[PDB]
Design a protein around this ligand. Sequence first.
Ligand code: 44E
Ligand code: CA
Lengths: 48, 691
Amino acid sequence: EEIREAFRVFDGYISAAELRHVMTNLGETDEEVDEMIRNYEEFVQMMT
Amino acid sequence: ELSTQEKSYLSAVEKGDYASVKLALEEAEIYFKININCIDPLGRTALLIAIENENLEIIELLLSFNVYVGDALLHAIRKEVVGAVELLLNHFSDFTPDITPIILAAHTNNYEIIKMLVQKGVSVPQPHDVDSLRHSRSRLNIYKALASPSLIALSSEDPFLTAFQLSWELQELSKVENEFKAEYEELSHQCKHFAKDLLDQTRSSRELELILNFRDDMNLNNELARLKLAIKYRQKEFVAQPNCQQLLASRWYDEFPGWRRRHWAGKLITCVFIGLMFPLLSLCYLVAPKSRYGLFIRKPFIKFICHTASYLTFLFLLLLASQHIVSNNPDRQGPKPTTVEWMILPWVLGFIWTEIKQMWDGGFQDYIHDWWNLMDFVMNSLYLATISLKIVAYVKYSGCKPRDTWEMWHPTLVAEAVFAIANIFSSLRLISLFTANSHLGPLQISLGRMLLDILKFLFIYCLVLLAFANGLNQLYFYYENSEGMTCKGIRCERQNNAFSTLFETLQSLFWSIFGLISLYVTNVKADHKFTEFVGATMFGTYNVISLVVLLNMLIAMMNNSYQHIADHADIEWKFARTKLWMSYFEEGGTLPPPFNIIPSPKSICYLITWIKVHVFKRRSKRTETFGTLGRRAAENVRLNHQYQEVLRNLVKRYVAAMIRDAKTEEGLTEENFKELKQDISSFRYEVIGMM
Ligand SMILES: CCCCCC(=O)OC[C@H](COP(=O)(O)O)OC(=O)CCCCC
Ligand SMILES: [Ca+2]
């Protein structure tokens, strides 16, 4: 368990449209940042 | 099975004639006076004859006149003819029924043929039965198909990993089959050469570091992950590559450039300096590894020097543990530890702790795989037994007793004996360091790689020893002869009762191989001369079998063994040296054993949390510890794309250097002569026809 805590980012379904800037506000393009997803509720499971 | 009209037709094909072949083919339509797809006295169809000689023109005539193709495609694959295959694609057998065109094409490792078949969408099965040879042949054909370098270049998005898992599969399966072991071992060695030749095509250190530094992230750097994986697959010819070894050597001597100005004594003084210097060089890293000298031991070569210096000080304390300048009174049952023993004990704990640490990362999987690891495990177990026996002596010994009156099987004596055996193992264990030195390295490796033969042959030696011990005891069973033989046994001043029991007979038969036994052990306290004669004859037969037959056979066996472990004594030595180096690369047990047990600055913050695993504090590690966005994939994706581009370049270079160095560099066989002859013949026939 110990899941559903990291959803404290601004969203609520999550797609690739709104996260590109999220890792750009604190990070630094489309052709590779898009793959971070590459749908909802899969990033807290199968992490261990 | 013959004729006179069609034999002219096959002859006109075989000689490359064109007008006659066209005439015969066109005349076959109106009159059935010829069978087009007939068989010559050797077993060749007209189409197959044209394929065998690369005469594509007659091939396309036959194809346009609907001759029975049958399996002529496979025969075109064998002759690796590209034009005939291209013309055949746009359209009782001689082969095992399970062979597909792509399998056979992979067998020949021909790039122009694999290229075309894959574009047509062919596929290869993947392995894991009342009959057995069909299945076994199918499995071997499959492996030999996808073990071809040409096919790995087309498929296999990760050629290194593919070759690695494939070598592992075939190495582990050459024992499961055990009847085709030669073929499977050959294929595994072939794909190992493929991996090495693919690494060889790098052209820049930048191109090399990415290859060696790559691994699956899965949200779990540059610590040579691919290289450790290659070690894990026993890929000993991939890590013996020149420039890879150059990278490792550069990363081993990072503390100081050069190391080539060194000579007979230049390197000795700088290493002896650090070997003396390791105590405070270690303490500095222990307390303040910030900027001054803590990073000086973190560097790998310095770590090696400090470790071997700590081992040598351990051995010095062990030798000095027997001098009388420090030894306690012998006439003292279970004495308190001597000051030298107090110094020694931290090394014992350090070695035990480092071996537990090593166990806790291999999980008894590679732990047993290293014979050095087994030796040091038994050494530490003997140390543990020594400590336990010494303390259990100390709890009730009360001292004040001469050693000549101690009862047999007393804890102090057994503790001393175990301590001595452990000293033997400890002083032996430094042989492993000789893998680092470029001169005792290969020699020590060859020592290791004929120890198995000595074990095999020593088993037979022990069987023979047991046989002769059986007989000799049967013979001198009754002459007990212990009426005046003070200190009975083989190991006396007179060698009495050597064969009076099974243990002493085993022991006497052992010593006789060294000559340290004498005759007149075979005598008996009576005039029974026939018993003495037959006993002496049995003893002499044993000696002849051992020292003239068996030992000479051992020599003649290891002679050829060494003759067959020198071809890869360098590559295997470099693999062992790399295995030793990478043990010191990581920032793990950087602290030599004397300065290892010393607790960490926290020492109460990591042990407890790892101890909180049987309670609810095991789950309090992935919820509050991690709460960030995990911004790593964007770096991971770019890294993977860069590595894929590097692989693409390496593969293209490997192809361009396998076609131009192996295809055009082999011999000239009779078939090529026949093709050239028939080219000339067809030329003559056509120019005759045009006039
Ligand atoms: C292979 C077993 C040979 C017999 C060993 C043996 O003990 O017999 C030795 C006999 C008699 O000597 P002993 O029996 O040993 O006292 O002399 C020889 O025949 C020498 C032949 C020398 C042959 C090398
Ligand atoms: Ca070890």
